[PDB]
A paper describes a structure:
SAP05 binds both the von Willibrand factor type A (vWA) domain of Rpn10 and the zinc-finger (ZnF) domain of multiple members of two distinct plant transcription factor families, known as SQUAMOSA-PROMOTER BINDING PROTEIN-LIKE (SPL) and GATA BINDING FACTORS (GATAs). The SAP05 protein comprises a globular compact structure with five β-strands that form an internal triangular mixed β-sheet core. β-strand 1 (β1) locates on the long end of this triangular core and connects via a loop–helix–loop–helix–loop structure to β2 at the opposite surface near the tip of this core. The SAP05 residues binding ZnF and vWA are located at opposing surfaces of the effector with the ZnF binding surface comprising the loop-dominated surface (loop surface) and the vWA-binding surface the β-sheet-dominated long end of the triangular β-sheet core (sheet surface). Our data show how the bacterial SAP05 effector has evolved as a functional adapter of the 26S proteasome to bypass the canonical UPS cellular proteolysis pathway and enable ubiquitin-independent degradation of structured eukaryotic proteins.
The crystal structure contains eight copies of the 1:1 complex in the asymmetric unit (ASU), which are closely similar. In addition to the two structural Zn2+ ions within each SPL5ZnF domain, a further four Zn2+ ions are found in the ASU forming crystal contacts. These involve E80 from four of the eight SAP05 molecules and H82 and E118 from separate neighbouring copies of SPL5ZnF. The SAP05 loop surface that interacts with ZnF comprises three distinct protruding loops that are separated by β-strands and involves six amino acids of which D66 locates in loop 4, G76, N77, and E80 in loop 5, and R104 and D106 in loop 7 of the SAP05 structure. SAP05 binds the two SPL5 ZnF sites, which are held together by Zn2+ ions and the complex involve nine connections, with SAP05 amino acids N77 interacting with three amino acids, D106 with two and SAP05 D66, G76, E80, and R104 each with one amino acid of SPL5ZnF, and SAP05 E80 and D106 each forming two interactions with R81 and R121, respectively, of SPL5ZnF. The majority of the interactions are mediated by hydrogen bonds with some salt bridges and are reinforced by nonbonded contacts. The SAP05–ZnF interaction is dominated by electrostatic interactions of charged and polar residues at the SAP05 loop surface and oppositely charged or polar residues located within α-helices of SPL5ZnF. Titration of SAP05 into a solution of SPL5ZnF showed an exothermic binding isotherm with a fitted dissociation equilibrium constant (Kd) of 0.45 ± 0.06 µM and stoichiometry of 1:1, and titrating SPL5ZnF into a solution of SAP05 showed a Kd of 0.52 ± 0.05 µM. Therefore, D66, N77, and D106 are required for the SAP05 interactions with the ZnF domain of SPLs. Taken together, these results indicate that the electronegative surface potential contributed by D66 is an important factor for binding SPL and GATA TFs.
Numbering used by the authors:
A (entry chain A): 36 to 132
B (entry chain B): 61 to 127
């Protein structure tokens, strides 16, 4: 398993983003109306809004399951997001195919 | 009158669902202070709610509670 401090990096593969609409855990945090992969600055409904910078082809989103962090569009590429967990126990990275 | 900040006339209808749900616009969610119901408050990042400034240490984005 991949770790940054007490935070586990968890890669999740999905056949499409629509699968997360029925995921008991993730469904409240995604904004399914948004174009391009987002990360969350906090834990609240629809919180995954911050545009990940220069995302790879298949990145669908990032969810930090705890903590708060800097919340800005087109600032952090995926590799940098791994460094701003700030108390998240898991960083879920959602991929297609 | 959807953003909780007194006199904020931002149309939250067209904002992301997060802002519509928490009755705060993007700028007011990030302001170090704003007048909410006549009181200097800050939008707590960790709580997604306005608190009075005494509930924060200095310029911290989240209140003193360690969640
Ligand atoms: Zn909420
Ligand atoms: Zn406002
Ligand atoms: Zn708070």
């Amino acid at each position: 398993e991949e770790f940054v401090g007490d935070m586990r990096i968890v890669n999740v593969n999905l056949s499409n983003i629509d699968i997360l609409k029925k995921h008991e855990t993730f469904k409240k945090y995604f904004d399914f109306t948004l174009t391009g992969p987002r990360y969350n600055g906090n834990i609240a409904e629809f919180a995954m809004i911050w545009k990940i910078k220069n995302p790879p082809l298949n990145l669908l989103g990032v969810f930090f399951d705890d903590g708060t962090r800097d919340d800005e569009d087109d600032k952090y590429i995926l590799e940098e997001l791994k460094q701003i967990g700030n108390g998240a126990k898991n960083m879920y990275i959602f991929w297609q195919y | 009158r959807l953003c909780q900040v007194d006199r904020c006339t931002v149309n939250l209808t067209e904002a992301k669902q997060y802002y519509r749900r928490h009755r705060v616009c993007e700028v007011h969610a990030k302001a170090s202070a704003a007048t909410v119901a006549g009181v200097r408050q800050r939008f707590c990042q960790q709580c997604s709610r306005f608190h009075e400034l005494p509930e924060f240490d200095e310029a911290k984005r989240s209140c003193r509670r360690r969640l």
